[PDB]
Design an enzyme around this catalytic site. Structure first.
Site, PDB file in Angstrom:
ATOM      1  N   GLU A  86      32.943  37.918  38.005  1.00  9.84           N
ATOM      2  CA  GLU A  86      32.507  36.539  37.813  1.00  9.84           C
ATOM      3  C   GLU A  86      32.752  36.095  36.381  1.00  9.84           C
ATOM      4  OE1 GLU A  86      31.646  34.532  40.109  1.00  9.84           O
ATOM      5  OE2 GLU A  86      30.786  35.645  41.786  1.00  9.84           O
ATOM      6  N   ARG A  90      35.480  33.080  35.697  1.00  7.85           N
ATOM      7  CA  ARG A  90      34.857  31.834  35.260  1.00  7.85           C
ATOM      8  C   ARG A  90      34.991  31.616  33.754  1.00  7.85           C
ATOM      9  NH1 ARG A  90      29.875  30.204  39.262  1.00  7.85           N
ATOM     10  NH2 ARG A  90      30.088  31.858  40.838  1.00  7.85           N
ATOM     11  N   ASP A 219      38.856  38.769  50.012  1.00  7.05           N
ATOM     12  CA  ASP A 219      39.770  37.616  50.031  1.00  7.05           C
ATOM     13  C   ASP A 219      40.746  37.581  48.851  1.00  7.05           C
ATOM     14  OD1 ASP A 219      37.635  37.150  48.298  1.00  7.05           O
ATOM     15  OD2 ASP A 219      37.048  35.253  49.186  1.00  7.05           O
TER      16      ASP A 219
END
Ligand SMILES: [La+3]
EC number: 3.2.1.113
Length: 452
Positions: A86, A90, A219
């Site tokens: 993350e 980000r 994914d």
């Protein structure tokens, strides 16, 4: 230069931003219904995620105000555990894109500071990184709820570390993430290119064997195979080979058709048993397939891309609010009185996730079919109608199937402004030169990085 729908996106961004400025400035996330904020990094997450979106939308006075915050208030030395994935997608990605678009070296200097603090996560026997690292203390560790790292998490940091090495001249970032890619290329336990969800840092081997999803925890492994290949100038053939193999594996094992509308969907496989369950996260896949075709992947990928884009659209529009839930289920056989898109009561939330509009952007850029713009506008109108908070901001909702009581969860996720609104603005643009498919690849938080 700005068209009607783009002005609409900007209206939505600035209503979102005035909630963030008024009630959560410098904090990770706005809680718009309560007019407050929450922290999990403590690093101005929403601000950093929206820097490049602000630049792209022409919101330059807002960008300058945010740049002053990064210059004076962004510091990485606190005693805080961060998730490597993350953090990378980000904060590291958001700073690198802010550097490229603005040219302001401050963002690169913050990126390199942050990247250095993430490096202890890679000190494992296998070199597959730990899930968590403390940017202040230097300790890295596995999660508490499991002993393993997550496959998508260790394979969805490569674009950012590679670009950081290219920009800084420090090879350690690229070397660490490329070891991960090469090792996973050689692992046993795939099913025709499909990967398990977890990987052990001590042994380096996959765990949770025989369970295959293209949703959460797997994914973006597939997304970054393709995108790294594009980034490196299409010379790293092992990436392409593993991507091509994986799409064939999707075709062989995970694709089925719904009732009553015969929609193509992607399900999950557990120990040989098919489950007709599809996270909204899987809706990344039509966009990735179409991006591949733009770059030379076979036309069969576009046939699949267009079918899946229609399915992902229906996952939104068959809901009463017009917004997709977190997870849908499909019926393989006729059920009287049922739509295609079934949703469990626990799965009815919408967290303002971007994957449908993400894929509409690529489908439009590659095909030029304006219906994909119309579908995106429809979805944005649903966001405006059911998630807007009058005082400022937009909120995740608990029930996409109750248009009278959608039940706001009082949180605006950073990817609403980092991704959902950015992809919509780009989708509506009259300019194929705007962040051209030839010049940039987007990281998995919609942060564009230059193709080498
Ligand atoms: La993503």
């Amino acid at each position: 230069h700005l068209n009607y729908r783009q002005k609409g996106v900007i209206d939505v961004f600035l209503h979102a931003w005035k909630g963030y400025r008024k009630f959560a400035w410098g904090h990770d996330e706005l809680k718009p219904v309560s007019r407050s904020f929450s922290e999990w990094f403590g690093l101005g997450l929403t601000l950093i995620d929206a820097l490049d979106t602000m630049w792209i939308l022409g919101l330059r006075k807002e960008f300058e105000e945010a740049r002053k915050w990064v210059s004076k208030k962004l510091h990485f030395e606190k005693d805080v555990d961060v998730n490597l994935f993350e953090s990378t997608i980000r904060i590291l990605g958001g700073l690198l894109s802010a550097y490229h678009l603005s040219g302001d070296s401050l963002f690169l200097r913050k990126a390199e500071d942050f990247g250095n603090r993430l490096m202890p996560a890679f000190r494992t026997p296998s070199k597959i990184p730990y899930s968590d690292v403390n940017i202040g203390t230097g300790v890295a560790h596995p999660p508490r709820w499991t002993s393993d790292s997550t496959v998508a998490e260790v394979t969805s940091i490569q674009l950012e570390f590679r670009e950081l090495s290219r920009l800084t001249g420090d090879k350690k970032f690229q070397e660490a993430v490329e070891k991960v890619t090469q090792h996973i290329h050689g692992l046993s336990g795939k099913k025709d290119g499909l990967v398990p969800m977890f990987i052990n840092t001590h042994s380096g081997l996959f765990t949770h064997l025989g369970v295959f999803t293209l949703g959460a925890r797997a994914d973006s492994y597939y997304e970054y195979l393709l995108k790294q290949w594009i980034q490196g100038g299409k010379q790293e053939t092992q990436l392409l080979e593993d991507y091509v193999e994986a799409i064939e594996g999707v075709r062989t094992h995970l694709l089925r058709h719904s009732e009553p509308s015969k929609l193509t969907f992607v399900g999950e496989l557990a120990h040989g048993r098919f489950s007709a369950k599809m996270d909204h996260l899987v809706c990344f896949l039509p966009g990735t397939l179409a991006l591949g075709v733009y770059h030379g992947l076979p036309a069969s990928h576009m046939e699949l891309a267009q079918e899946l884009m229609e399915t992902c659209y229906q996952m939104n529009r068959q809901m009463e609010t017009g917004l997709s839930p977190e997870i849908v289920h499909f019926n393989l056989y006729p059920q009287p009185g049922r739509r295609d898109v079934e949703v469990k009561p626990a799965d009815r939330h919408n967290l303002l996730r971007p994957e449908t509009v993400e894929s509409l952007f690529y489908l439009y850029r590659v095909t030029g079919d304006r219906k994909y713009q119309d579908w995106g506008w429809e979805i944005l109108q649903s966001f405006s109608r059911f998630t807007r908070v009058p005082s400022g901001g937009y909120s995740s909702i608990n029930n996409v199937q109750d248009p009278q009581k959608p039940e706001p969860r009082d949180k605006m996720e950073s990817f609403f402004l980092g991704e959902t609104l950015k992809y919509l603005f780009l989708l509506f643009s009259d300019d194929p030169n705007l962040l051209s498919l030839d010049a940039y690849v987007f990281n998995t938080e919609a942060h564009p990085l230059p193709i080498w």
